[PDB]
Write a protein that binds this DNA or RNA. Structure first.
Lengths: 99, 50, 51, 41, 97, 154, 129, 57, 165, 265, 97, 129, 157
RNA sequence: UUUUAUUCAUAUAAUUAAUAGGAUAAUAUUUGUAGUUUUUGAUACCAUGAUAAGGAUUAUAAAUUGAAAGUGUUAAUAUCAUAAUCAAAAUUUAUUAUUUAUAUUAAAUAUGUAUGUGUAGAUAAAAUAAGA
């Protein structure tokens, strides 16, 4: 079975490999670093509580500074980003899962 | 710098070389110390905001 | 004869001939077949050619 | 055939069957219908 | 339409789609027709005025015919007045020579 | 030359069987004739294979004559003899082409492809910048400045 | 009912691999002719839908080739003097023989002359013969 | 299972329909509205060479 | 090569004339054309595959922008693109209805006009007839799945179902 | 009994039902008992509406407004992170209901729409109607949607609503909105006394009397209500000096045949 | 001359391709340097038509032109099979293969 | 049973290892960039063929030696410098021959073709040591 | 509600009906989203009137409004699922599974062709067809010709 | 005593009944049309159609550039007319025809692991603008 280029019906088939040092920014992220963060980083309306943050949200300093728990959906039921660090800043959550 | 047009212009000064403990014999990075602990920042948000 | 031309002139002629198709003034003052006041073009569309 | 009924407007089978007009014919107007002038509302 | 998009509800929006698709209006004007004396007593467009007009309309002029195709508005009634307005602007700027 | 990657080898029968596509390609044959002429030697085997290929390609469309009329005792043996004789002439031409290409490479300081032998200055197959660190068929390790076959100047 | 329209019955005809009639199909080709339909102009045939044959838009009533060409036409050409390409290139030469650039104004592609002769006239190397 | 088509012409006509059919269509109405064996076989065979016929076995 | 494009004013010119840059500015003002400032001068790539008559695909118009880094995200593409309003998308969104006889007229209105009551679907009718045959044969094994159970759990006063056997 | 809903309530008034019960009603022959979306209770309707927009709306558990403190998945229940903890690392940029609604002049550019909601809010009282006629209020546009005026394809009677919405004529939304918002008063007076546009009318009058006909027309482009006859009078008066007969006739016709013959003065 | 360019440049100075164009003037027992010939391309235009099939098409066109010009040249060319078209055609596109 | 917890702990350990791996990879990339490479030109073809005391080599050693030393013989800046100087002309891409990518990305002194396979494999740097 | 009364043999046929809503919302929200994205992403000055910090603040306000637009349809069209309206069969656009003009799956199209339900003209299964644009370049050439007819023939004043 | 090739990659998650028209029309607040509640085959079963594999043979000689691809059945599969308890969004999950050595990540998130002298067994394909 073959499908049109860059139009694979599978959306989660993309396996984000180990981050590459030489680029580390022009891979799985925004093409330009002068662009604004996606909508997942912000709150649109008065919610009653988010179950888990999506994997498209970029990682910021406030994630490790605030201390609030963050979790994403993976092969298991859920994965919480325990022991927050500062090395993963400016990267989306999909690059730190290894499905 | 990415290796597209300018890569030889990279210098060791850009490399922090202080947030990790490196092998004094080979030169590879052995371990990395914690970074969020007692982090020093003048402004977590851009200065012009608020 | 025989016809020998240059590539730049040939390219320019071909492009100009392709471009200048809708730049036709239908209603002129010429006598004969061409030259009139109003022009109506009725396009009939069908499933079959003989229809 | 089937729960979904066939469309009599765009189906070539019903359009060119014995009970309708084939495509190898003059394709003229069948009848000059006049409704609004015979009885307007 | 007269085949299957009449006498029913979808006929209205099908006709609106047809009108929006055919909203284009093409206005054609000849330079030889422009080259006439005006009310003031001078030629409306001279050689320099024609050259300036041809430069201003890079591809809108062709075979000596100035053609402007307006698709600006959904209806031909507004496309025609937009085309006339733009042609008037172009003529006013071209007469500057 | 400009082609320096790894190459596979094919039997001469395959290239001979390839007709007016590679082996009998007129442009390639003209290049071989020029190579012989600039060296000032006769092109007798090249002309022999040229006329053989011309005769074969002219009548390749025509159907073969009825084999029943032909005598299997003698006519088939004669046809096999002629075919083998033509094939041997083409083999000789192929060998001459390869030999003279190697010789001209050696004279012109042209570095051949990997595992290619140039008699007089390589004698074992020159290999350079290959996918495998070791020399194929020899198992000799290869340096990074692969091999300076010729003198530096010019 | 609506379905009452689709109830007219057709009466059976009165007599006295698959799909092929052996008698007509096995007839010799050199005698029957390599033809599966009357040799009338192809404009009279339309590829039938849902059937692997070609029927005529006029039911029967075949018209011969001489019914489309002028009387006593050569090879059924519209004009006996030239073929299609002759009629095209002679026309091109004739119109170029009286082409004038001033006349090209107003109309569109019709103003462009015969390119083969126009460009060869515009080529300086062709001036010296 | 299989619908009854009744290809027989005697199984699809009844007197009630024939009564109304006869008035509109009858012999008089139809007349009003309408207007050497070897040699014959040979000419029949060779007439297939016409521009609107084919040679048939 | 690298250089600075020079401009000469008509007043500074020995003989005044209308400069091509001034004419370009006037044309841009007339036609409301956006002047791209960061357009490199060394990228005048002709779409030869659509402009050369020597190619099969010649059309006389440039069919490509000849920019590898071109996408729908950039504002230039956004400004020069075409909206899908009143397009084939809009035609399909109203014509490709799963039930064809619902874009012309409402089923209930059509039934109430042509017929006297709203007819059910063919599948619904077949299910009803099959239920009739099953009830005639066995009259057992059926459930009582309903939308609102209030009327079944609290039957109206004066309702007495007659037994079967 | 396998009843989907345990409870149901009527919609007709108690004053009229008790008298109308004596008149037999012609029910649908193949389905006499009809249990529509209106007959559902308040809680059942809220649950059904919340479940309806499971793809894009708050129907998905993680989307929001789920009102559930724990989610059971993969045989492992997970607690919910509250909004107070979420906003620590998600900076809130909430504007409120004022953001979803676009101005009236953007209706044509948004294909006959004003509200930027998850569901298409029809302006006719027949698609988003639930017992009462459908009325869309732009000052109360919220995700909870106390009035079920939106259009979704996962409710009890969604199929007919979708069919009606897709089977709509041109200018359907604009016509419905204009007809419902603007109409002649019962007193017979023109609807030209609104306060939300009176300063704009005065501004246009001042521009016309100063002679700025282009500015007056540009401001008139943005009006939503029927202008008073003074606006047309001033526009025509300011067109008089310029001999702009075409403009005068156009501004006369824009109010003569289109807006309750206000310009008929 | 082919498409306004010399035959040697059109065929990239390939003898085995130009001899096919020359052949009709030998089979008819004529002189090549007595006639002006022009070739117009009307199929799929390609940057290089230097191939055996294109040379065959050119030879057929020249043979037909010679037959039209001098009727008696029909017999030699027809006997040599220069006006005999071959209906061979490359396989069409198909995802199966 | 317990696979959720096991996978969560495995992913935690994997991310903790990934932080150190990223640090080491960045260090290796910077060191490779700042370290001098080998001469990225084929010494077997016309331009870069002559003796070290004649031809292009004297020009290199008396004109562009400082720039080559600053660029550390990386192939891209070396080629760009040779194009910018223009004393060689357009021959860089038409007549000059250069070493392949992974052969010209070797360190300064290798003398062995088995060097690209001996580079560090735990560092994810797309072939940049 | 849940398989009590559905009136249809395939319950998945309602997915087409609900996808029509997606297309309608795209028609509603395409202009607003495009304008917001262009204004937010543009870095060069908008005009002579507004430059610098005013432009930066306007960009941030525009992107804040765009993020606050709840329910705005911003989805690539190729991510939309394509299912035939008659048999609820899913097909991938760009492959033989889907027929673009009929907008039905390959199975539905084959059924309608083998029956008398669509008026199509059979051609050779391994050719280019009657169309000269298809025979003279193929799908891409016919694509370019369609583009030229639709757009690249007007003066565009 | 004849010729060609073959390492092939995602795969399940929860709810589906109605018709209602607007400017330039001699007048309808029908502005804003308000009567809950007796039914039940596929969230998981319709067996029947197509397809795969796939073959047939007359054209003498002259002229002409001409006068030249055709399918049963056996099989497997499946979404259709036929027999109620449940697959399509939270995708790991292993599903045949791929870029091999002068230059290699810029616009929707778009692949870091198999260099090893191209070295088995089996399998498929064609006489088709090519040149057995």
């Amino acid at each position: 079975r073959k499908y049109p280029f860059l139009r694979r019906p599978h959306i989660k088939n993309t396996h984000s490999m180990n981050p590459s040092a030489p680029y580390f920014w022009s891979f799985m992220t925004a093409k330009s670093q002068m662009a604004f963060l996606p909508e997942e980083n912000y709150i649109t309306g008065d919610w009653t509580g988010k179950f888990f943050v999506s994997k498209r949200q970029v990682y910021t300093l406030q994630h490790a500074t605030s201390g609030a728990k963050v979790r994403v959906k993976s092969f298991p039921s859920i994965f919480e980003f325990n022991s927050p660090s500062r090395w993963n800043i400016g990267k989306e959550m999909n690059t730190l899962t290894k499905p | 710098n990415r290796p597209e047009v300018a890569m030889h212009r990279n210098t060791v000064g850009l490399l922090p070389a202080h947030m990790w403990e490196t092998d004094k014999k080979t030169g590879k990075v052995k371990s990395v110390k914690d970074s969020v602990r007692d982090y020093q920042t003048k402004t977590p948000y851009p200065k012009w905001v608020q | 004869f025989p016809f020998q031309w240059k590539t730049e002139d040939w390219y320019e002629y071909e492009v100009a001939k392709v471009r200048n198709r809708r730049f036709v003034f239908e209603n002129t003052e010429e006598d004969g077949i061409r030259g009139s006041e109003v022009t109506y073009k009725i396009v009939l569309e069908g499933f079959w050619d003989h229809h | 055939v089937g729960y979904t009924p066939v469309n009599p407007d765009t189906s070539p089978m019903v359009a060119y069957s014995q009970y309708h007009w084939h495509y190898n014919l003059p394709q003229g107007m069948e009848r000059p219908h006049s409704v609004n002038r015979t009885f307007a509302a | 339409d007269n085949l299957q998009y009449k006498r029913y509800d979808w006929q209205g929006w099908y006709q609106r789609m047809l009108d929006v698709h055919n909203r284009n209006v093409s206005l054609r004007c000849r330079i030889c027709d422009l080259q006439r004396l005006d009310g003031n007593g001078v030629q409306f467009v001279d050689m320099q005025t024609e050259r300036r007009l041809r430069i201003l309309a890079q591809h809108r002029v062709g075979m000596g015919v100035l053609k402007l195709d307006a698709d600006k508005y959904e209806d031909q009634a507004d496309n025609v007045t937009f085309g006339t307005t733009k042609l008037s602007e172009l003529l006013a700027d071209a007469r500057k020579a | 030359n400009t082609f320096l990657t790894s190459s596979v080898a094919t039997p001469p029968i395959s290239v001979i069987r390839t007709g007016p596509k590679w082996w009998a390609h007129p442009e390639r044959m003209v290049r071989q004739k020029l190579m012989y002429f600039t060296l000032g030697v006769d092109q007798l085997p090249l002309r022999r294979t040229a006329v053989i290929q011309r005769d074969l390609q002219r009548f390749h469309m025509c159907k073969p004559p009825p084999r029943v009329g032909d005598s299997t005792g003698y006519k088939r043996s004669r046809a096999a003899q002629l075919n083998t004789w033509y094939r041997r002439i083409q083999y000789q031409e192929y060998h001459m082409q390869h030999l003279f290409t190697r010789h001209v490479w050696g004279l012109l300081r042209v570095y051949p492809g990997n595992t290619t032998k140039i008699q007089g200055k390589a004698d074992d197959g020159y290999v350079g910048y290959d996918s495998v660190p070791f020399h194929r068929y020899n198992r000799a390790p290869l340096p990074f400045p692969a091999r300076e076959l010729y003198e530096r100047r010019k | 009912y609506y379905w009452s329209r689709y109830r007219m019955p057709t009466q059976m005809p009165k007599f006295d691999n698959e799909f092929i009639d052996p008698i007509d199909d096995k007839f010799p080709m050199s005698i029957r002719g390599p033809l599966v339909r009357p040799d009338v102009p192809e404009d009279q045939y339309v590829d039938s839908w849902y059937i692997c044959t070609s029927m005529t838009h006029h039911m029967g009533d075949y018209r011969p080739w001489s019914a489309s060409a002028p009387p006593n036409a050569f090879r059924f050409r519209p004009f006996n003097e030239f073929d299609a390409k002759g009629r095209e290139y002679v026309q091109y030469m004739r119109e170029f023989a009286r082409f004038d650039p001033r006349k090209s104004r107003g109309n569109g592609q019709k103003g462009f002359p015969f390119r083969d002769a126009y460009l060869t006239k515009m080529n300086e190397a062709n001036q010296k013969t | 299972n299989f619908p009854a088509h009744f290809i027989k012409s005697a199984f699809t006509t009844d007197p009630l329909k024939e009564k109304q059919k006869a008035r509109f269509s009858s012999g008089g109405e139809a007349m009003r509205e309408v207007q050497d064996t070897e040699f014959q076989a040979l000419v029949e065979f060779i007439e297939g060479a016409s521009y609107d016929q084919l040679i048939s076995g | 090569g690298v250089h600075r494009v020079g401009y000469t004013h008509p007043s500074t010119l020995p003989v005044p004339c209308a400069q091509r840059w001034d004419l370009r500015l006037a044309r841009a003002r007339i036609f409301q054309e956006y002047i791209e400032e960061k357009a490199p001068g060394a990228w005048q790539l002709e779409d030869e595959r659509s402009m050369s008559p020597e190619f099969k695909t010649f059309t006389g118009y440039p069919m490509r922008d000849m920019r590898p880094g071109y996408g729908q995200n950039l504002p230039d593409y956004i400004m020069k693109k075409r909206l899908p309003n009143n397009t084939h998308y809009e035609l399909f969104a109203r014509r490709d209805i799963p039930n064809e006889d619902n874009a012309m007229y409402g089923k209930y209105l059509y039934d109430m006009t042509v017929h006297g009551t709203s007819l059910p679907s063919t599948y619904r009718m077949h299910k009803d007839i099959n239920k009739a045959q099953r009830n005639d044969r066995k009259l057992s094994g059926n459930r009582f799945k309903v939308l609102c159970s209030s009327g079944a759990k609290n039957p109206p006063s004066g309702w007495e179902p007659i037994p079967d056997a | 009994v396998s009843g989907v809903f345990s409870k149901g309530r009527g919609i007709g008034h108690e004053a009229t039902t008790s008298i109308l019960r004596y008149i037999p009603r012609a029910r649908v022959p193949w389905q006499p008992s009809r249990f529509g979306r209106e007959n559902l209770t308040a809680a059942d309707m809220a649950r059904l509406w919340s479940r309806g927009r499971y793809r894009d709306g708050p129907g998905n558990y993680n989307s929001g407004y789920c009102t559930e403190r724990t989610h059971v998945l993969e045989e492992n229940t997970v607690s919910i992170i509250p909004r107070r903890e979420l906003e620590k690392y998600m900076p809130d940029i909430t504007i409120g209901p004022k953001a979803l609604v676009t101005p009236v002049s953007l209706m044509n550019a948004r294909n006959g729409h004003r509200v930027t909601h998850d569901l298409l809010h029809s302006y006719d009282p027949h698609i988003g109607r639930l017992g009462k006629p459908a009325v869309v209020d732009h000052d109360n546009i919220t995700v909870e949607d106390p009035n079920r005026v939106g259009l979704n394809a996962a409710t009890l009677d969604c199929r007919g609503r979708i069919y009606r919405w897709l089977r709509r004529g041109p200018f359907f939304q604009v016509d419905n909105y204009f007809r419902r918002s603007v109409k002649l008063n019962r007193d017979g007076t023109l609807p030209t006394d609104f306060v939300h546009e009176a300063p704009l009318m005065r501004k246009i009058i001042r521009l016309a009397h100063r002679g700025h006909l282009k500015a007056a027309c540009e401001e008139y482009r943005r009006v939503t209500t029927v202008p008073p006859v003074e606006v047309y009078r001033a526009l025509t008066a300011c067109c008089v000096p310029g001999a702009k007969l075409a403009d005068a006739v156009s501004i006369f016709e824009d109010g003569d045949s289109k807006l309750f013959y206000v310009s008929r003065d | 001359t082919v498409m306004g360019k010399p035959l040697s440049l059109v065929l990239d100075n390939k003898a085995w391709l130009m001899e096919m164009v020359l052949m009709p003037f030998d089979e008819a027992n004529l002189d090549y340097r007595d006639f002006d010939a022009h070739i117009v391309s009307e199929g799929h235009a390609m940057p290089s038509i230097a191939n055996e099939i294109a040379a065959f098409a050119l030879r057929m066109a020249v043979a037909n032109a010679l037959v039209k010009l001098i009727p008696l040249t029909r017999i030699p060319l027809k006997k040599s099979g220069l006006l005999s078209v071959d209906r061979r055609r490359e396989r069409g596109q198909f995802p199966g293969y | 049973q317990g696979f959720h917890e096991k996978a969560q702990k495995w992913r935690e350990e994997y991310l903790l290892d990934r932080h150190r791996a990223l640090a080491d990879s960045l260090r290796a990339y910077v060191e490779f960039s700042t370290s001098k490479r080998v001469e990225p030109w084929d010494a077997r073809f016309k331009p870069f063929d002559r003796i070290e005391k004649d031809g292009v080599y004297v020009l290199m050693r008396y004109m562009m030696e400082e720039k080559l030393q600053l660029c550390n013989y990386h192939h891209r800046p070396v080629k760009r410098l040779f194009c910018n100087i223009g004393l060689m002309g357009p021959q860089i891409t038409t007549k000059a021959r250069w070493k392949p990518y992974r052969f010209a990305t070797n360190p300064a002194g290798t003398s062995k073709a088995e060097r690209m396979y001996q580079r560090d494999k735990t560092v994810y740097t797309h072939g940049h040591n | 509600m849940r398989h009590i009364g559905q009136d249809v043999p395939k319950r998945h046929t309602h997915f087409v009906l609900e996808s029509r809503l997606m297309y309608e919302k795209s028609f509603r929200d395409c202009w607003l989203h495009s304008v917001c994205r262009a204004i937010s992403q543009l870095d060069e000055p908008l005009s002579k009137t507004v430059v610098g910090t005013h432009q930066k603040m306007l960009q941030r306000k525009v992107t804040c409004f765009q993020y606050n637009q709840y329910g705005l349809f911003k989805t690539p069209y190729y991510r939309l699922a394509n299912v035939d309206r008659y048999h609820a069969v899913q097909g991938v656009a760009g492959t033989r599974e889907w027929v673009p003009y009929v907008n039905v799956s390959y199975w539905t199209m084959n059924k309608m062709v083998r029956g008398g339900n669509l008026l199509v003209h059979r051609v050779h299964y391994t050719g280019w067809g009657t169309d000269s644009h298809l025979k003279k370049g193929g799908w891409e050439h016919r694509w370019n010709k369609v583009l030229q007819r639709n757009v690249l023939q007007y003066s565009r004043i």
